[PDB]
Amino acid sequence: GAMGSMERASLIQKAKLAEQAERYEDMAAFMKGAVEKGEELSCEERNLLSVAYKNVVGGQRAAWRVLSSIEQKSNEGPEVREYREKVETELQGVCDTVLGLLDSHLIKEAGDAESRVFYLKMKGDYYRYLAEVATGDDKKRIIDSARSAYQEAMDISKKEMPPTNPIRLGLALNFSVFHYEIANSPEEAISLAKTTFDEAMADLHTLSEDSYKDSTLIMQLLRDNLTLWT
């Protein structure tokens, strides 16, 4: 790794600097280097890792959709297809990189619910981004890989976290979107979002003002989707 010679703490520091500078490719490379030091990640470090790659893959997804839309109109020279493929391959590469970090060896060393659910949710997310661009004979297996990861994360979160836990809430949000538009299960999506929202509502009374803010922010995203879906 090109980050093999840099101190773990320096990589984390520079990831935070890169975030401030909106240099998310750099941020992701720094956090990949930190992961490859082999130590477990703290909560803050997990969030740095996720924010970095979410920003990188988000740009790729938005670009892919623009090209995927222009390509569909053109259908209903080879250049549109070629360039959509180029972006698609880059996007798949980022997803494979993240999945590789989770498999070697973040998930297997994650024993606390807050770390293990976080990583399994990420695994679901990056298989979902692969599913968004998948068209071949592996699309069903990619979708089932996303489903499996989300389901394991859900099972742990329901046993080990309160219904307002923001990790649990964000997992349920993303799994519901998976259902709606990847699994073509809109009713499952709506059910999951509603049940998640209502069970969180009923647990808000236990929270401090700060935790209340964190939980209600994600609850509003569930509501946003339910409003579009119903």
Partner: peptide
């Protein structure tokens, strides 16, 4: 495409 809300940075 209409994108639904998911967790974290709305980076796309």
């Amino acid at each position: 495409k209409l994108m639904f809300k998911t967790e974290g940075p709305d980076s796309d």
